[PDB]
Amino acid sequence: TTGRIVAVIGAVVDVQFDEGLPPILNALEVQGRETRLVLEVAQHLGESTVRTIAMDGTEGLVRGQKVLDSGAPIRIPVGPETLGRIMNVIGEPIDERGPIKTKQFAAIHAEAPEFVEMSVEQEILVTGIKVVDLLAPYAKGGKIGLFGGAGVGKTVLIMELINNVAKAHGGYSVFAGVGERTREGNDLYHEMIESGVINLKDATSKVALVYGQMNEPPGARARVALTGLTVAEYFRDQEGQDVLLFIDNIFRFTQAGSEVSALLGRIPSAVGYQPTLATDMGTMQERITTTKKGSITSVQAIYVPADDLTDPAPATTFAHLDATTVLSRAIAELGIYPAVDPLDSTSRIMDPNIVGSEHYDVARGVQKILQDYKSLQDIIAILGMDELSEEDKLTVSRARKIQRFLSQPFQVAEVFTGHLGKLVPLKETIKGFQQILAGEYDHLPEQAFYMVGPIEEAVAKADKLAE
Amino acid sequence: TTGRIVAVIGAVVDVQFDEGLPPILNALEVQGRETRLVLEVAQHLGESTVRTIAMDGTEGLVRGQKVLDSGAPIRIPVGPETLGRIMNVIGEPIDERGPIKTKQFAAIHAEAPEFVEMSVEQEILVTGIKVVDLLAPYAKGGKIGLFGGAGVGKTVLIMELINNVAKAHGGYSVFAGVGERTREGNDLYHEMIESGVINLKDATSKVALVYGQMNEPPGARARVALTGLTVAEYFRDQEGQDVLLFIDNIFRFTQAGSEVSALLGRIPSAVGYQPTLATDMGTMQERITTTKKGSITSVQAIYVPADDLTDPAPATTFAHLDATTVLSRAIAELGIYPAVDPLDSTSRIMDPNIVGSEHYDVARGVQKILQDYKSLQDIIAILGMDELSEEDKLTVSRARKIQRFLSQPFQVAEVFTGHLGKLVPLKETIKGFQQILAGEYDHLPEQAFYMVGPIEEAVAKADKLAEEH
Amino acid sequence: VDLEETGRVLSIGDGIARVHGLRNVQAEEMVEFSSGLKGMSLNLEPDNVGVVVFGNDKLIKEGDIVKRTGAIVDVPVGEELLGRVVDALGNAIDGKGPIGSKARRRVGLKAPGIIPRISVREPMQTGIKAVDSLVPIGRGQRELIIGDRQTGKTSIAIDTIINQKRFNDGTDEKKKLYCIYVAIGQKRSTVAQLVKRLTDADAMKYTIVVSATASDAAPLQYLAPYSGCSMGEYFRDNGKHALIIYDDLSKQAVAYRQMSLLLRRPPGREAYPGDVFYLHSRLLERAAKMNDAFGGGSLTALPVIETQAGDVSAYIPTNVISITDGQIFLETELFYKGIRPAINVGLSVSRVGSAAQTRAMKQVAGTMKLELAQYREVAAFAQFGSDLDAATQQLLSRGVRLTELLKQGQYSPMAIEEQVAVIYAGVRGYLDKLEPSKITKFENAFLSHVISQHQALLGKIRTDGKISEESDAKLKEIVTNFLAGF
Ligand SMILES: Nc1ncnc2c1ncn2[C@@H]1O[C@H](COP(=O)(O)OP(=O)(O)OP(=O)(O)O)[C@@H](O)[C@H]1O
Ligand SMILES: Nc1ncnc2c1ncn2[C@@H]1O[C@H](COP(=O)(O)OP(=O)(O)O)[C@@H](O)[C@H]1O
Ligand SMILES: Nc1ncnc2c1ncn2[C@@H]1O[C@H](COP(=O)(O)OP(=O)(O)O)[C@@H](O)[C@H]1O
Numbered sequence A: 001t002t003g004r005i006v007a008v009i010g011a012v013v014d015v016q017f018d019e020g021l022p023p024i025l026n027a028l029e030v031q032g033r034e035t036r037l038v039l040e041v042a043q044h045l046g047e048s049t050v051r052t053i054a055m056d057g058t059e060g061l062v063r064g065q066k067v068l069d070s071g072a073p074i075r076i077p078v079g080p081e082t083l084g085r086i087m088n089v090i091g092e093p094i095d096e097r098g099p100i101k102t103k104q105f106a107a108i109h110a111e112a113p114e115f116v117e118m119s120v121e122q123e124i125l126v127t128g129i130k131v132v133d134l135l136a137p138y139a140k141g142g143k144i145g146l147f148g149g150a151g152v153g154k155t156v157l158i159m160e161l162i163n164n165v166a167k168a169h170g171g172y173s174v175f176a177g178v179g180e181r182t183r184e185g186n187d188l189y190h191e192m193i194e195s196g197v198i199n200l201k202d203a204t205s206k207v208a209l210v211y212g213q214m215n216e217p218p219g220a221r222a223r224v225a226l227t228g229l230t231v232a233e234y235f236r237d238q239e240g241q242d243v244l245l246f247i248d249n250i251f252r253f254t255q256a257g258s259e260v261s262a263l264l265g266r267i268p269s270a271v272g273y274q275p276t277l278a279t280d281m282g283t284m285q286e287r288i289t290t291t292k293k294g295s296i297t298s299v300q301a302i303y304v305p306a307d308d309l310t311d312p313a314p315a316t317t318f319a320h321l322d323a324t325t326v327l328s329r330a331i332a333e334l335g336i337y338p339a340v341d342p343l344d345s346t347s348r349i350m351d352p353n354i355v356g357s358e359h360y361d362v363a364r365g366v367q368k369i370l371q372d373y374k375s376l377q378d379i380i381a382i383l384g385m386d387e388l389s390e391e392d393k394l395t396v397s398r399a400r401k402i403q404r405f406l407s408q409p410f411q412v413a414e415v416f417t418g419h420l421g422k423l424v425p426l427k428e429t430i431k432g433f434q435q436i437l438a439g440e441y442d443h444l445p446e447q448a449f450y451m452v453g454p455i456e457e458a459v460a461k462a463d464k465l466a467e
Numbered sequence B: 001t002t003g004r005i006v007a008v009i010g011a012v013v014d015v016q017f018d019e020g021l022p023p024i025l026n027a028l029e030v031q032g033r034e035t036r037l038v039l040e041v042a043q044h045l046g047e048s049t050v051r052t053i054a055m056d057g058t059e060g061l062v063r064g065q066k067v068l069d070s071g072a073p074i075r076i077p078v079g080p081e082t083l084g085r086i087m088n089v090i091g092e093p094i095d096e097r098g099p100i101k102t103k104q105f106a107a108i109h110a111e112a113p114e115f116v117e118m119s120v121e122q123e124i125l126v127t128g129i130k131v132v133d134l135l136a137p138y139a140k141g142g143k144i145g146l147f148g149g150a151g152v153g154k155t156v157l158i159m160e161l162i163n164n165v166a167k168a169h170g171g172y173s174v175f176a177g178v179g180e181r182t183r184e185g186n187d188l189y190h191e192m193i194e195s196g197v198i199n200l201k202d203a204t205s206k207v208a209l210v211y212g213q214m215n216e217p218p219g220a221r222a223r224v225a226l227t228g229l230t231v232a233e234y235f236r237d238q239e240g241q242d243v244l245l246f247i248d249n250i251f252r253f254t255q256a257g258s259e260v261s262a263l264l265g266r267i268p269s270a271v272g273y274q275p276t277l278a279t280d281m282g283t284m285q286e287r288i289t290t291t292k293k294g295s296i297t298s299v300q301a302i303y304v305p306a307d308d309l310t311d312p313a314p315a316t317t318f319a320h321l322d323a324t325t326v327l328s329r330a331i332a333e334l335g336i337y338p339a340v341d342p343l344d345s346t347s348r349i350m351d352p353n354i355v356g357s358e359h360y361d362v363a364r365g366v367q368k369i370l371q372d373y374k375s376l377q378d379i380i381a382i383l384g385m386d387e388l389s390e391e392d393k394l395t396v397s398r399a400r401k402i403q404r405f406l407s408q409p410f411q412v413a414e415v416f417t418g419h420l421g422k423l424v425p426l427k428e429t430i431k432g433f434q435q436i437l438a439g440e441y442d443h444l445p446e447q448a449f450y451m452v453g454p455i456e457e458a459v460a461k462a463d464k465l466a467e468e469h
Numbered sequence C: 001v002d003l004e005e006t007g008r009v010l011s012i013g014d015g016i017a018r019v020h021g022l023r024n025v026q027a028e029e030m031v032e033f034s035s036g037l038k039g040m041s042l043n044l045e046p047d048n049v050g051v052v053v054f055g056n057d058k059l060i061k062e063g064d065i066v067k068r069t070g071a072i073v074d075v076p077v078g079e080e081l082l083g084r085v086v087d088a089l090g091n092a093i094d095g096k097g098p099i100g101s102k103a104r105r106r107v108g109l110k111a112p113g114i115i116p117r118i119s120v121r122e123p124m125q126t127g128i129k130a131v132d133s134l135v136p137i138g139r140g141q142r143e144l145i146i147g148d149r150q151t152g153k154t155s156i157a158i159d160t161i162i163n164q165k166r167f168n169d170g171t172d173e174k175k176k177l178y179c180i181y182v183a184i185g186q187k188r189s190t191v192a193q194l195v196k197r198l199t200d201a202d203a204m205k206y207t208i209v210v211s212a213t214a215s216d217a218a219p220l221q222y223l224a225p226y227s228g229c230s231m232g233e234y235f236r237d238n239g240k241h242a243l244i245i246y247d248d249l250s251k252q253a254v255a256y257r258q259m260s261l262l263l264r265r266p267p268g269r270e271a272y273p274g275d276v277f278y279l280h281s282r283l284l285e286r287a288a289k290m291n292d293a294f295g296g297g298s299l300t301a302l303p304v305i306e307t308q309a310g311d312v313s314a315y316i317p318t319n320v321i322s323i324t325d326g327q328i329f330l331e332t333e334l335f336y337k338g339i340r341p342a343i344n345v346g347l348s349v350s351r352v353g354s355a356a357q358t359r360a361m362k363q364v365a366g367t368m369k370l371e372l373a374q375y376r377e378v379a380a381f382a383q384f385g386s387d388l389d390a391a392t393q394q395l396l397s398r399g400v401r402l403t404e405l406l407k408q409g410q411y412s413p414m415a416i417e418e419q420v421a422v423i424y425a426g427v428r429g430y431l432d433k434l435e436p437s438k439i440t441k442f443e444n445a446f447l448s449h450v451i452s453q454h455q456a457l458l459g460k461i462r463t464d465g466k467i468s469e470e471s472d473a474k475l476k477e478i479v480t481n482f483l484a485g486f
């Protein structure tokens, strides 16, 4: 049924139906625009009026324009033809490459899988990255913070995770660029095309990109995360597989929600964030879980405002994170890649029950030795190296070798290192670190470990560097 | 036309009209008052109602009283007759010497000079104050600001500037006192009469005081700045002559607007200020300017609430000045007077082209040595000062000497210090600071420089301390 | 009476007319009051319209008649503006006659998508060593200049504008850069002295100064950035390169806040409406670098932000820091201890990075960056100086020289080849045997010397865009010979 725009205040449009209102969260199409303006319902003001938030600029809206009630929340195409295609929040393709042809359509406002559908065994997604899989293992159907800004390997790490999970599990990936700079979005698109995760020719792309750009009204940056979740939920339920869901950034999601709530006229909460911050985060973060058909594993880039870890935004986000990966510049300088910081990185499933006793003990051994080396670095920098016991020097050697062993070559960063990429299975990593810690390889040189895959490959390098 | 009052809430009065409606900024006279009450229209609320701000206390107003629309904004007398008088916001005299009989009236609201009318020349204006002349030289025709907390030296400094410049000025002068103590207004009036600047008998006065002191209801404190500014506008344009315009304080012009804002029905801005703070101040500070047809050397004292230079009011004013001399409480605690902060006072003519290479080099040397001293104090906190190297003990000693030498005794502070006020022409300041930097005075104690004029006087004082030792 | 194409003012006050009628008025449309005053219709409500008046509400009575012009706000464009001073709507305010521009554009157009762009790769030469080497700026970038009061931001912008004169006076056409300087909420005399300064350097034949000064109504200060950005998009969309400087972008936010709070929209944080991100993002996202299919033009942006007390966690500073591809901090502590431009090179960044540096400046600044990075982590010792090994001693003896090379003076940008020569001398090590206080003199001498005798070497560096080992050897010889006789 058609209503009439009665009010237009900024990005908030009040429409007046006459026969029957649309339930909250439906999508309404404004008739008369060259582009497609979609208004999402937000309130039922009474007198048959509904207050709504626009997904595009509301310049040029006359008071009286006809508005057609679509009949269901924003619906996007969620076939397997999305892969390799960029789309925006309302599902249009923004790569000027032709319409996204699919037989399925999904409504972006869903509900969390019920309690019965929840899976109760806490598994371990194997990313194939040694440092990520040893010290801070990722969990199927878990949320994973990703700290570290630019210049550290965030995009290359994202591409490597995409590739490995599409290769070692057969599961695709979604990238919801909430509040995405257009420059950075184009750069990411072209980096992916170059690196092969996206492919423009042979329908074998492993990524579905969704972009809510930074110049869209807040009503559209607060919903793109749900578009990404919709595509990934399709890949989980109607194709029963694992999925990766990258969310860059997760702070801009809460900020967009805050602006929308302010526009609607709601009393700001503690530090200006919306009153509904907890449940706005919950409805989204609670659809990223491992049901009985598949799992969505979300890697959420996190920005901490004012270097304040108790700010309501990160405070609400960290209640959901199941792991943390801290890319640090101080380890890109040392030439170790990925820059993942072995000590700041943490995880919930570093628990002998979840990952196992051998995995757990190897991880704690590596952490202990690296902490000891960190402590001894100060003494080496102060009192000199010559005044360390034999055991101290042996631990320094072990720690340097372990450091170098955490570095790995990525199949997507070949053009940088030139080294052919490797995918280290979990058991091989545990074996390699068990051996390095027990001392089996005290008789090899440090550089024999830099940028190698399994440990046996390190031994091969050690031989070939003395011949 | 003729309206009738309909609501009185604080200093905000609503008036309902049945004839034509009076445009905004008009002045309406309330009928039936012992003393002239003028309401300046400020809003049209619809239904032939206008919301207005009373320029004088609304005690004893009655709903239904009659109000006559004067037909034009507040008009004030102008001309060379207002010289030597004292005026309200509404221009009627308050020095009890009969009416100001002029030919010229001016409306206190008027647009600002267009961009095609501005001047672009800059020539240093020697003031006789070492710190001001050295680190932040003023400029003829430029706007000047004195940012102070409470009780740091804004008023003593502006009285010193009056004494110095207004007495040695070919042109006229104006002192608009916006919402500061009445004791000070009377003090200034008597000081001028006793110093010849004002003259009661004949027509030889060079100052046109205007007063909106802090007992005036906010509608009046927010406008008297425009009244003094109108007098200065006239002297700039019609007389075609140079003018001075001292305003003290220019914060109260903002504070009064904040006071009335809420009752006018405006959501409050960041720190309780009116939402229109920036524009309500631009429309004023943009009329205080030199133009091709005149010149105003405006000086303005500016309260800085709680010494918070990041407050919206001073923060917004900083952009409207050609030179700022941020008086500081910390320096005033060390006894250095004037308290001017050398590392926060800036200027637009402090360039090697406008003031000369040597002046610029010396000013930057003073600033750099003081900043180095600031960095060193952190170390001196822990190590003690005997541990400092020998290239830094020299830096600290020189910096202390320069801090002391920046102080000076004013002629209007003889009541406090007892010393004799001094004027230090520019050459003495530059030469003395050159010498202090070069090291030509490492043999004199630092206290030899405290509250002295030229450098030779510091030498003489050091000799006298030695002799009396 | 007509209440579709015409309406009548219900109310006025503080610059926000409330009009009744205008049933067919579009949002953000330009209506005209009976008093020759324009206005922009922002709030469309069921019972009235909220018009923001472009001027003084003294002339807007109640009951006035408002007629809609039928068009969204639009501004003139073209090379007919170059060298003029226009106001927030294209009207000239320099009194040189009418503007005479054929074309027009809408202020509120949308940015280019994701496909039209191409990665920023050309260098936008600012003529400032500290910027051109350590925090480079490409074409199509958005490099915030964020600082305190009187730290030298406007001077960075004006040095950038003045530098382009060497390119604009040449014959190469893809190096020409046209500058736009949007001056928001500034004393008119400041803009007049700035226009005089640009004329002095003869940099006013390719500059458009858009003026929205303090006296101007809030909507004009709200609208000036978009006017400038449209006049710049015109050059972007015609194979030309533009550079727009908003100065500041905090005063646009203040003006927008004033309009919102007077239209009674929900306040939000610091009383800023909920659109102070959308407002700035949909402005700064128009700085692009079109690919060749779209002309190849570009549009850089250098928004200027003032931070109160170095507080970069405030609302607007963080809003504009999360939108841009870098930032150039200008701290005052460094300003007063000789480091001018006071570009704190620790906090400054450029997410574009060295992708937008000429191969020569890459060759040299790549190691200069690391040398300063090492110096910055043993800076504290500088006071103690002695009592430390030769390692940190040499670190902070190289750092001091490198720092004193980056000092520069008002309105005197340096050609890229001369910056490369100076940084080469400094970092390759031909200065560590020199008292720091004299370094500047050496520079100001060496520069001139190289300019006089060895112009051919500078020409080769400029054209090849690289330090070929032949040129490298010749430059080493020049530096050694000069440094010998000093
Ligand atoms: N590179 C430089 N070398 C020497 N002095 C400089 C330099 N840059 C700026 N200055 C000085 O700093 C002062 C302030 O300069 P500028 O106007 O650029 O700062 P600003 O941030 O624009 O000031 P405001 O914030 O008041 O607009 C000027 O007097 C100028 O002489
Ligand atoms: N495993 C790796 N091998 C080689 N180079 C790497 C690796 N990881 C990161 N880098 C380098 O670090 C830089 C960081 O850029 P990138 O991570 O792509 O974007 P961002 O800095 O936005 O995360 C890259 O240019 C890349 O050359
Ligand atoms: N030049 C000076 N010499 C000595 N004492 C001063 C000087 N300037 C200010 N003082 C002291 O500081 C006080 C500050 O008062 P004043 O400057 O008149 O008001 P304001 O609070 O507006 O600055 C003075 O009463 C005086 O005691």
Ligand SMILES: [Mg+2]
Binding pocket: B154, B155, B180
């Ligand atoms: Mg005082």
Ligand SMILES: [Mg+2]
Binding pocket: C153, C154, C155
């Ligand atoms: Mg400036």
